[PDB]
Amino acid sequence: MHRTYSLRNSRAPTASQLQNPPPPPSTTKGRFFGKGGLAYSFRRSAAGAFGPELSRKLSQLVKIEKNVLRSMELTANERRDAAKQLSIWGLENDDDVSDITDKLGVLIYEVSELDDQFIDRYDQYRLTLKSIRDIEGSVQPSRDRKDKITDKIAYLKYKDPQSPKIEVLEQELVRAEAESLVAEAQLSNITRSKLRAAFNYQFDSIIEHSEKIALIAGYGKALLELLDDSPVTPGETRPAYDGYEASKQIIIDAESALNEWTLDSAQVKPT
Amino acid sequence: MHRTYSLRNSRAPTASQLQNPPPPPSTTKGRFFGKGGLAYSFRRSAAGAFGPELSRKLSQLVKIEKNVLRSMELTANERRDAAKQLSIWGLENDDDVSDITDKLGVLIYEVSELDDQFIDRYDQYRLTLKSIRDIEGSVQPSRDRKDKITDKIAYLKYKDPQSPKIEVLEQELVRAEAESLVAEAQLSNITRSKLRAAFNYQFDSIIEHSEKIALIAGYGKALLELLDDSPVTPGETRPAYDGYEASKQIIIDAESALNEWTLDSAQVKPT
């Protein structure tokens, strides 16, 4: 949607893009459907199946959100595995390198834990959407019966103008219309309420998790200053790294700001 | 209901009973069920069968009314047969006797025709009751579903206090309650309207037919004065009967009053 007014689907570069040019496209693009294969697309296909034809789209969205959740669960546990592997690799290295890589590993572990909490809040969002899907599916048969009744009464009117069955189904249809009006009014109310609440909670969760992980990334950037990037000539060895206390103080302050973080202290501000 | 305040089911004698004592009970009481046998009771039994349990009584009443109609049809055609047989018997008799019995036969034929018209109006009454029975039967499943839903939601509340299914069925039950309120309001309205109209028409039909047949009976009583009841001694023969013109004038006046009869000219008056 950010594409410029040209013939190319090229997004307009932001100030960050001008500051640092965008990198080349990733080489990880594999020759695959990109939906987890037929095994993971079985759920997607089953979403588009014999349903109430009304919550079909909503049920499909819910099951797609379940796929989202499964993928995020896959990238959280295996990311914390990556952090563990990074610490294991940094075990046998320079003392400053080992300390700094262990601190980066623990920061990534914090990242994975926040991802898991975001996953739980995502499941709350998905459960609210499941509730709205189920109430919509329960309210659909009312309108289905309404459509069937109006079609049958139209056919009966075609057959003759004085069948008692005609008047009886008209009398039942005036009841069905009122019940369907009430059902659709409450359906609109519940859909609006669930939609607003679920998406407000979802956006609050994502902004909280994202600003928290950004607060973590800033602390990690500050921590990365401890190691010295000055190259050392072959032969003599550089002085030993004694910044253990500084790194521990940095991680302590990061923990303190992490625990102190609250919705009131949301330094992110729109304009 | 007219029984006196005693231990016997003996009705209080009216002024007619004092004027002429009641006759002995009829000897036509046969040793039978009195419902036309099992063949004619098959319909009555089928009325009390797998129905909506609400219009069961009304459907039974309708089918009983059908039995009423069939019996009345049996006694109308066969009564006109009796009138024909009476004329055939009076064929070979005295001239005055033959004329008077032919006039009584034609009066009974008029009676049978009025009975047939009353039967048609009775069928109108029965059709209105069929309509009310059918709308009541169509409205019963609403309350049946209401009862089933409230029982199921009570059981689900017993199981747990937070099942989503519980809230969904409560939301559908608040719709079902409103639709059932509307259905019962229109059911009461239609029942009152059909009941009042059908029974007012039925009572107007019965009073019209009855006062007409009474107007016929009075004319027949006046006509019976033509024949002479004075006994004749054996031997000589009484003078010939020349009252053909008087009888024809009586029947002409009866026809004129029959055609002139209208609801406005209803000389029967309550007090």
Curated annotation (Swiss-Prot), chains A, B:
Comp. bias regions, Polar residues: 1-19
Phosphoserine: residues carrying this PTM: S16, S45, S98, S163, S230
UniProt keyword annotations, A-Z: Isopeptide bond, Lipid droplet, Phosphoprotein, Ubl conjugation
GO biological process terms held by the UniProt record: eisosome assembly; endocytosis; protein localization; protein localization to eisosome filament
Predominant cellular place of this UniProt entry's protein: other
PTMs per UniProt: Phosphorylated by PKH1 and PKH2. Phosphorylation is inhibited by sphingolipid long chain bases (LCBs).
Chain positions with Phosphothreonine modification: T14, T233
Cell location: Lipid droplet
Ranges where the record places region Disordered: 1-31
Cross-link position per record: Glycyl lysine isopeptide (Lys-Gly) (interchain with G-Cter in ubiquitin): K29
An annotated Gene Ontology molecular function: lipid binding
One GO cellular component term: mitochondrial outer membrane
Miscellaneous notes: Present with 2157 molecules/cell in log phase SD medium.
Protein function: Negative regulator of cell wall integrity (CWI) in unstressed cells, probably by inhibiting protein kinase PKH1/PHK2 activity and regulating their downstream CWI pathways PKC1-MAP kinase pathway and protein kinase YPK1 pathway. Activity may be regulated by the transient increase of sphingolipid long chain bases (LCBs) during heat stress.
Protein name: Sphingolipid long chain base-responsive protein PIL1
Native source species: Saccharomyces cerevisiae (strain ATCC 204508 / S288c)
Residues of the full protein shown: 1 to 271 of 339
